[PDB]
A paper describes a structure:
The structure of the trypsin-resistant core exhibits a group of long alpha helices (around 90 Å) that are amphipathic in nature, with their hydrophobic sides interacting and their hydrophilic faces showing greater exposure to solvent. Analysis of the trypsin-resistant core by SDS-PAGE following reduction and Edman degradation of the major band showed the N-terminal sequence HSLIH, corresponding to residues 12–16 of the Cry6Aa sequence and indicating processing after Arg11. The deconvoluted intact average molecular weight (MWavg) value of 46,844.19 Da matches the theoretical value (46,843.43 Da) expected for a core protein containing polypeptide chain 12–390 disulfide bonded to chain 444–475 with a mass error of +16.2 ppm. The 3266.38 peak had the sequence CPENNFMIYWYNNSDWYNNSDWYNN, which matched the CTP2 sequence from residues 451–475. These results show trypsin cleavage after Arg390 and processing sites after Arg443 and, at a lower frequency, after Lys450. The solved structure of the trypsin-activated Cry6Aa corresponds to the major core of the toxin with the longer CTP1 fragment (from Asn444 to Trp472) still linked to the main body of the toxin by a disulfide bond. This bond can be clearly resolved in the structure (insert).
The Cry6 family of proteins from Bacillus thuringiensis represents a group of powerful toxins with great potential for use in the control of coleopteran insects and of nematode parasites of importance to agriculture. To increase our understanding of their mode of action and to facilitate further development of these proteins we have determined the structure of Cry6Aa in protoxin and trypsin-activated forms and demonstrated a pore-forming mechanism of action. The structures obtained are novel among invertebrate-active toxins and are consistent with Cry6Aa acting as a pore-forming toxin.
Author numbering: 12 to 125, 128 to 387, 445 to 472
Write the structure that this text describes.
């Protein structure tokens, strides 16, 4: 965006928001969290027993499922549990950190309906260097100045700690929490194991097995290329199961993309081919195709998890420095104003920092406004209704031709 370039350029301004960017993205990136969120949706819908699996990949009741397939269930459950944890414990924090940026920015610069805190600080400095002002009024202005800065320092520290807490939550998402949460790293390990096993046993049984499973892998590769290529999301984030269980959820908006429409047609073709195929081909390609895509997904969850850790360590440092600079403002700078009887330079710095804060506050608001909202295993992952809309409204599950 134009605004992202403005934010870097501004990132040098004292009392301002600093470099709240991440490459060509806002430091809280709409596109990043939208993409991640797609993988999580897929996770939230994973099946954990035979009947669920059949319903999910859309396999005829008349088809037998070999026993080694059962390994799927435990790891799918863990993956699902992970997704649910993320949905409850991680993603809402991201929304909150965006809100913290909007809140601070509108507080110091003022809400567009307005005086923000920086204008109030400026006027206080006016009173401190006014010669008409008697000594009592000076002393009072100084106390008010320090108090108001103290509130900004407290909030900045709160936001700093919130960013630290996001980093901690990410480390738990990836490495587990030493309790009932298995980490993405271990989930990835087991998913790769099961993938190897099932591929050896049921993924190379015939030429058509290899052909079709390779076709699905190619579609996932292209889909992923397209996803990583599209930088700018213009719509409120929603998700779609249009591509079905072979590929997983995608951000709804990306359905417009020509390449993705091509992929939808190739998927419709696969469905036609499988639904009337020899039973073992039908079964193996649905189940293992989906599993291969889940492995690609979990790889993406891992790497983008590590990336996000780096981003929120950066944000953490930004709030630390914001608080440090306001502490300097209320002590050393304020004393200099008193000694020099000159406040104009500080006042103009506060004006300029106000404008920079407006820029990042608008980006934070935009993020929030457009973000997505919404061995037994039968008790750890009970059946829920999560996929039912998708089973009732996605083409993959249309069986009129059966």
């Amino acid at each position: 965006h134009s605004l992202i370039h403005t934010i870097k350029l501004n990132s040098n301004k004292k009392y301002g928001p600093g470099d709240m960017t991440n490459g060509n993205q806002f430091i809280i990136s709409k596109q990043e969290w939208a993409t991640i969120g797609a993988y999580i949706q897929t996770g939230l819908g994973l099946p954990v027993n035979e009947q669920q699996l059949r319903t999910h990949v859309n396999l005829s009741q008349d088809i037998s499922i070999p026993s080694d397939f059962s390994q799927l269930y435990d790891v799918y459950c863990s993956d699902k549990t992970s997704a649910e944890w993320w949905n409850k414990n991680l993603y809402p924090l991201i929304i909150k950190s965006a809100n913290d940026i909007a809140s601070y920015g509108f507080k110091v610069a003022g809400d567009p309906s307005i005086d923000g805190y920086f204008k109030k600080l400026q006027d206080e400095l006016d009173n401190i260097v006014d010669n008409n002002s008697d000594d009592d009024a000076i002393a009072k202005a100084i106390k008010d100045f320090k108090a108001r800065c103290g509130i900004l320092i407290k909030e900045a520290k709160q936001y700093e700690e919130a960013a630290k807490n996001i980093v901690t939550s990410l480390d738990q998402f990836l490495h587990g929490d030493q309790k009932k949460l298995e980490g993405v790293i271990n989930i990835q390990k087991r998913l790769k194991e099961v993938q190897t096993a099932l591929n050896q046993a049921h993924g190379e049984s015939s030429p058509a097995h290899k052909e079709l499973l390779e076709k699905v892998k190619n579609l996932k590769t292209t889909l992923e290329r397209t996803i990583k290529a599209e930088q700018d999301l213009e719509k409120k984030v929603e998700y779609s199961f249009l591509l079905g269980p072979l590929l997983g959820f995608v951000v709804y908006e990306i359905l417009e993309n020509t390449a993705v429409q091509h992929i939808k047609n190739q998927i419709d073709e696969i469905k036609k081919q499988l639904d009337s195929a020899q039973h073992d081909l039908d079964r193996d390609v649905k189940i293992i195709g989906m599993l291969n895509s889940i492995n690609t997904d979990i790889d993406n969850l891992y790497s983008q998890g590590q990336e996000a850790i780096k981003v929120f360590q950066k944000l953490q440092g930004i709030w630390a420095t914001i608080g440090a600079q306001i502490e300097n403002l209320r002590t050393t700078s304020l004393q200099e104003v008193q000694d020099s009887d000159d406040a104009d330079e500080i006042q103009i710095e506060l004006e300029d920092a106000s404008d920079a804060w407006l820029v990042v506050a608008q980006e934070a608001r935009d993020f929030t406004l457009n973000a997505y909202s919404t061995s037994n295993l039968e008790y750890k992952c009970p059946e829920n209704n999560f996929m039912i809309y998708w089973y009732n409204n996605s083409d993959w599950y249309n069986n009129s031709d059966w």
